[PDB]
Amino acid sequence: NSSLWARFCEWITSTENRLYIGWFGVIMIPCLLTATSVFIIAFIAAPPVDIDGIREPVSGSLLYGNNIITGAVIPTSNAIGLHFYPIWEAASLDEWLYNGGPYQLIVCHFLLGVYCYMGREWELSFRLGMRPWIAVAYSAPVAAASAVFLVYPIGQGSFSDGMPLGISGTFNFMIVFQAEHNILMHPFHMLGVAGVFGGSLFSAMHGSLVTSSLIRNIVAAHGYFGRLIFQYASFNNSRSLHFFLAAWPVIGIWFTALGLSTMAFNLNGFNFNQSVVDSQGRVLNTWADIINRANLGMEVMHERNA
Amino acid sequence: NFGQIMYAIRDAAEKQWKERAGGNYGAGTKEIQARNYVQRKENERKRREMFDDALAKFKENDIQGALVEFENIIAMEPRNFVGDNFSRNTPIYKVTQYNIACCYSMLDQVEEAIKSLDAAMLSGFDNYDQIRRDKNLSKARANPKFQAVLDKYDEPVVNWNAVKATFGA
Amino acid sequence: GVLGAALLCAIHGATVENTLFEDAEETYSMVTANRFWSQIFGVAFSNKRWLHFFMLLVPVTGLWMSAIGVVGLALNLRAYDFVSQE
Amino acid sequence: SWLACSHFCLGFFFFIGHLWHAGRARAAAAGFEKGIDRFDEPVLSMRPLD
């Protein structure tokens, strides 16, 4: 069994490696390495990109006079849109950079890498004999990343709408998105906020109860919880409790990702404008109307061109 | 001895580990893991040298000793073994129980040889040509149940009989 | 802190629920989970008490730090501008 | 918009269903879907990872 294929297969599939590789690792590792290398190099040094495609470059590279909080990899230029833009279809390297190819490269490699990582999370679980569906719990952040980076640009028809790979770029993306669509006033984003807050609450409470009970007992913690709030005798066993802990945030993030993808096809949140009207036809402002005014400001300042 | 009976039929260091109750990794688990690994390594080492003894003796035509050796090597098969490539059985396990299935044929024990080769098939002895072609096992091949088990584990790919019958109609 | 708290909640629930023993003693296999997460992610918990205390430490620190930030805003001390970039 | 949104959501959910059911089926076929045998843990048969 000394054949090159045999020993190579044994090496890859072996658990002796410090970090398990697996077959999914074959595509997972190189893709993430390419993505992180290009990301680091572009962030450190890269020329301004024409995000809006009207010859108004936007500096986003760390070396070109901007900070960590402000540095970002500008998304692909609006002119290209959904067309596939590797290096070799570009006229030249300088033009490739001016248009913003490295964002497209990074996002493609990153999506492939995260999918392969989700796969290996099942493969190793199968090796060790543990139950298989830890990948399902991982499908939430993967779904959200796919919605942010791939599905929303597809819906809007251009790759310039993808989230910039930076902090201030992320804030700009969120503000512009709230301007175009009422993300705040959409039930799926409400479910996402509920999921995140409930995850924090449950993590804190469970940690407190378990760490308090660990003295040298679970019955005492169960009685503590039952007596604290009026609720009694729920999550009597660790199985149900630890399943609920995983079930809440995962469903919340699934729903928020689905909401983002739904908005990718222009299905906005609730629109409660002029909902309240007095007699003989006047408009009484409500909080939704002040939110609408804020959206007006954001949107009007967003339209850089006439 | 397991070997003799089958041919006839033809904690001191673990108390710290039993940290598992407290849900902690610790150090006792590391000691138990090392001990289990080295014991396993010696297990397949001695199984390999026993297989070498078995083949060397089968070359001498002492099928009795070969059979006892092969029913002893299967004896020490680890329980709940998952292989590196999801094998579920040590690679020797499939070949040895094929050879014993051959040896049972030399003993004029076709009835149990059928079960031995059935168990060989279950383990994933995916090599189908020799069992059909090998003259050495031809003595047991005469039994119809041999072909029955071969068919249920090697089905004809194309139903020539069915297609011919449909053509007739 | 908040997002990390949600992450920890999800991961702990999935890990505990996916390493049960067939059917006192802990229901789930700590060694198996430690091996799994140390080989995939790189670092995995080894002490149960430390893990269940970390799940408590994260959100509390996050919200306390946000509260300090809001106190800073209460007097209009806001990290609003970068002078150099402006 | 209705068609696209509804069918994207349904496709994503059915993909998650594929993940779940495929994992469960493979685990059941392997034979350790009910849980670890608590006597012969495959991890224990491996050396400590250092």
């Binding site: 970090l19 760390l62 | 990794y25 150090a27 590391k30 | 790189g42 670092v43 080894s46 002490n47 | -």
Partner: peptide, 28 residues
């Protein structure tokens, strides 16, 4: 020169991550 400071901080952090991965202390 602030760029060099930022890069130093980033690579230092990555070094801490690398050491935490590969150079773990065997517990007890």
């Amino acid at each position: 020169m602030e760029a060099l400071v930022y890069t130093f901080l980033l690579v230092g952090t990555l070094g801490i991550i690398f050491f935490s991965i590969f150079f773990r202390d065997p517990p007890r």
